[PDB]
Amino acid sequence: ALSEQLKHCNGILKELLSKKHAAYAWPFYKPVDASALGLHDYHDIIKHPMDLSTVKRKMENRDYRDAQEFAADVRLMFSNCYKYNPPDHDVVAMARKLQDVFEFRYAKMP
Ligand SMILES: CC(=O)N1CCc2c(sc3nc(SCC(=O)Nc4cccnc4C)n(Cc4ccco4)c(=O)c23)C1
């Protein structure tokens, strides 16, 4: 039985993957495939890749100790996007919008 706080995190994760946010969540569904995207410097710049499917697997495997560890992975995902891509890139605009959704509901932690 997940703790109350980790149940809240699982709900956040379900919302982030839902159709309601799919227009800006889609770049974060799967690990960045640097070779497929021609981003041949991605893994020289990003040392710890993260994506929503990895967060989902770690939640299902009970990897996360607490809500703080879950939130660190979600924020690592956004930070990687801000680090690698130029600030005017469309994916950065999508990252900002998905992070806005995350931060406001994470703040409602019970
Ligand atoms: C999280 C993060 O930092 N990422 C780096 C940047 C990026 C992605 S996913 C993605 N899709 C596209 S286009 C459709 C696509 O390529 N799909 C695809 C194809 C082959 C293999 N895997 C996929 C998903 N473009 C180009 C573009 C310019 C404006 C919006 O999108 C991207 O820059 C990215 C992840």
Side-chain angles (χ1 to χ4, degrees):
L2 278 178
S3 65
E4 273 194 67
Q5 300 201 338
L6 278 169
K7 292 271 194 183
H8 184 64
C9 292
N10 197 50
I12 292 177
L13 176 67
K14 181 79 169 187
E15 176 174 358
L16 293 187
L17 293 162
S18 69
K19 276 307 187 315
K20 175 178 62 272
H21 305 297
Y24 36 92
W26 68 261
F28 313 97
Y29 282 167
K30 300 304 297 160
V32 171
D33 194 335
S35 189
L37 294 163
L39 312 176
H40 299 299
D41 56 347
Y42 187 78
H43 295 290
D44 298 283
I45 292 165
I46 299 307
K47 312 308 189 311
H48 302 283
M50 187 50 57
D51 69 285
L52 289 175
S53 73
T54 300
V55 176
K56 179 174 147 62
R57 181 202 93 234
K58 294 178 74 170
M59 181 68 55
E60 295 164 335
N61 298 352
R62 306 315 199 259
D63 194 297
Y64 293 118
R65 169 198 201 256
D66 42 24
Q68 291 89 325
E69 194 183 342
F70 161 90
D73 262 358
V74 175
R75 289 158 173 164
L76 169 63
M77 182 189 68
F78 292 127
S79 295
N80 288 342
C81 183
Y82 307 145
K83 181 179 189 183
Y84 178 76
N85 300 277
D88 60 333
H89 201 284
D90 287 339
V91 172
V92 173
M94 297 181 186
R96 296 184 68 205
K97 285 175 68 176
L98 195 69
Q99 178 154 31
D100 170 67
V101 171
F102 168 76
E103 294 293 343
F104 270 90
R105 192 173 178 188
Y106 187 76
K108 296 173 178 60
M109 181 76 49

